[PDB]
Write a protein that binds this DNA or RNA. Structure first.
Ligand SMILES: *O[C@H]1[C@@H](O)[C@H](n2cnc3c(N)ncnc32)O[C@@H]1COP(=O)(O)OP(=O)(O)OC[C@@H](O)[C@@H](O)[C@@H](O)Cn1c2nc(=O)[nH]c(=O)c-2nc2cc(C)c(C)cc21
Ligand SMILES: Nc1nc2c(ncn2[C@@H]2O[C@H](COP(=O)(O)OP(=O)(O)O)[C@@H](O)[C@H]2O)c(=O)[nH]1
Ligand SMILES: [Mn+2]
Ligand SMILES: [Mn+2]
Length: 544
RNA sequence: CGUCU
């Protein structure tokens, strides 16, 4: 049947010179040694990611799909949505957003400049009326930093990103932005993944897993999920959008966006030639993150009934997904997950790595993270969220003229602040750099470094300063990830942080706070860390 | 490029 893409042969060009590493990486050449292993996915490789994602999709839905889709449309019934004033939509355009062909950019859209407000008024007028003629879209390579894995091919090709003009993107928010805010939370309930915070996700899977008389979990993600999206899939997506209370102007524009934009259309490279025709999800539209999640919930929930997964609890975050269900004996469980994958490929959502049932919560990985255990200050099992530190580390060493990595360090130091690798490797190197730079209180990312103990206690609680025995898996992984990248062994970071703690305490003030809290683990003789006044005297909602 | 915390 349908082919996800049909190419013209025109290279996917780069929309701006690509960064090259320098002969000295001054910030990270103490963090790790093997810089030759850290790469970035240029548009050269885009040529070859194209091959990976072009193929012949063919679905075979069945009574299990159609039973789910029906009650999901019944969830959609209880949702009331509203249009978005052309102004309000312009106000939600991101500040660095890519400018429009027709001479105006994000700065002009957000300040309601006259020229932009008229062009968008006419785009939205072409959206109403003309419901058939496609909307031209642009196709970009996406540059990303990784570590080479010789096992799995050496260097990943660049993911492909496809987006309409800026005029169109404001119109999408008009038609669909309010939908996105309500629909998934309504159709999927507690199974909606983006809803939870890192601590909340953990509390969930822990509850889901103890609620079983004999738990069994697995994760499933589909391969090339943007490409496995058939046209019927998108139109059945609209079928759910339209099931809510919409002003009639919404339905017209929605229906026209689904035809002219979402179901496919031409594609042009940054140079401007014709590049191909797309017949799948264009990753890079408003619905992308929500369509993905909803479609995935349907196909998943369908396949759960086909295979007979019993009492399953779910957690969908886009096309990543995890099911904690009731074990049916080992050898039925293996048979069911094959039925599961079987349905999921008859739904045009084949897997990547084939799923496998696991009976220990640490071995399930969804959204590039897993759950592990450590011991808390009192001796209690503390469950946190961790990951394979390979890619965060490779990114800590990405250092060109344009890009500086200190953001990458903080972004992970916060997100994964309880993990052994952050506590010992990232935090040690972070303060070790800023004390020497003497830039120990800039405003990196709208954040101040000297607040980290307060921020961390706000988000992960005081135990992130006092967690000590680490799970065997997590040790072997951290140890081996450092080894893979040239970084010192954990032993060396223990000594390095012992000293970074010294300079921090001795600097006094808010610095000495960081030294005693973030590096309690380093000292021979701990200090009993009490809560901080800023466990509420810190606004809990600047990003969370 | 889009969504999100
Ligand atoms: O490696 C990432 C990541 O750790 C952090 N980052 C980016 N986006 C987010 C979100 N949504 N939540 C949490 N943390 C985030 O910063 C790194 C990305 O920046 P990068 O260095 O890759 O790009 P540039 O060098 O072009 O720009 C420097 C940025 O650091 C800067 O723009 C800053 O504003 C990043 N930043 C956000 N940026 C953004 O556009 N939107 C957001 O909502 C952002 N939120 C945050 C939140 C925090 C806590 C930080 C530290 C930075 C953020
Ligand atoms: N626009 C955009 N979409 C993304 C990005 N990453 C993931 N997605 C979407 O979410 C889906 C999840 O895919 P992923 O698990 O990252 O890898 P894949 O399934 O092999 O393509 C993708 O097909 C995209 O549609 C991104 O950086 N930008
Ligand atoms: Mn995937
Ligand atoms: Mn995924």
């Amino acid at each position: 049947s349908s082919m996800s893409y049909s190419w013209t042969g025109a290279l996917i060009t780069p929309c701006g010179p690509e960064e090259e590493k320098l002969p000295i990486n001054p910030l990270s050449n103490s963090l790790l040694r093997y810089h030759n292993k850290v790469y970035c996915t240029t548009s050269k490789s885009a040529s070859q990611r194209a091959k990976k994602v072009t193929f012949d999709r063919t679905q075979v839905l069945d009574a299990h799909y159609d039973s789910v889709l029906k009650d999901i449309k019944l969830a959609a019934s209880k949702v009331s949505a509203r249009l978005l004033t052309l102004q309000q939509a312009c106000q939600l355009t991101p500040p660095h957003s890519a400018r429009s062909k027709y001479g105006f950019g994000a700065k002009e859209v957000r300040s309601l400049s006259g020229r932009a407000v008229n062009h968008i008024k006419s785009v939205w007028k072409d959206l109403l009326e003309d419901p058939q003629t496609p909307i031209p879209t642009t196709i970009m390579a996406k540059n990303e930093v990784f570590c080479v894995d010789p096992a799995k091919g050496g260097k990943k090709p660049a993911r492909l990103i496809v987006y309409p003009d800026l005029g169109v993107r404001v119109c999408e928010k008009m038609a669909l932005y309010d939908i996105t805010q309500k629909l998934p939370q309504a159709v999927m309930g507690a199974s909606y993944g983006f809803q939870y915070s890192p601590a909340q996700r953990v509390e969930y899977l822990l509850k889901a897993w103890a609620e079983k008389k004999d738990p069994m979990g697995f994760s499933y993600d589909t391969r090339h999920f943007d490409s496995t999206v058939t046209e019927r899939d998108i139109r059945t997506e609209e079928s759910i959008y339209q099931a809510c209370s919409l002003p009639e102007e919404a339905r017209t524009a929605i229906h026209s966006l689904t035809e002219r934009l979402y179901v496919g259309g031409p594609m042009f490279n940054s140079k401007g030639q014709t590049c191909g025709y797309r017949r799948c999800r264009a990753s890079g539209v408003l619905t992308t993150s929500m369509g993905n999640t909803i479609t995935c919930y349907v196909k998943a929930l369908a396949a759960c009934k086909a295979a007979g997964i019993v009492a399953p609890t779910m957690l969908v975050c886009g096309d990543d997904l995890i099911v904690i269900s009731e074990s049916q004996g080992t050898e039925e469980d293996e048979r069911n997950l094959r039925a599961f994958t079987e349905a999921m490929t008859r739904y045009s959502a084949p897997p990547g790595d084939p799923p496998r049932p696991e009976y220990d919560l640490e071995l399930i990985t969804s959204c590039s993270s897993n759950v592990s255990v450590a011991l808390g200050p009192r001796g209690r099992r503390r469950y946190y969220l961790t990951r394979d530190p390979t890619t965060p580390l490779a990114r800590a060493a990405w250092e060109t003229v344009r890009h500086s990595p200190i953001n990458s360090w903080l972004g992970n130091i916060i997100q994964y602040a309880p993990t052994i690798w952050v506590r010992m490797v990232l935090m040690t190197h972070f303060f070790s750099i800023l004390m020497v730079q003497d830039t120990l209180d800039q405003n990196l990312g709208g954040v101040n470094p000297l607040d980290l103990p307060a921020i961390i206690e706000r988000l992960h609680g005081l135990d992130a300063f006092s967690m000590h025995t680490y799970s065997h898996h997590e040790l072997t992984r951290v140890a081996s990830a450092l080894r893979k990248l040239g970084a010192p062994p954990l032993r060396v970071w223990k000594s390095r942080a012992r000293a970074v703690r010294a300079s921090l305490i001795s600097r006094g003030g808010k610095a000495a706070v960081c030294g005693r809290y973030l590096f309690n683990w380093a000292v021979k003789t701990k200090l009993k860390l009490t809560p901080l006044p800023e466990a509420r005297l810190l606004d809990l909602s600047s990003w969370f």
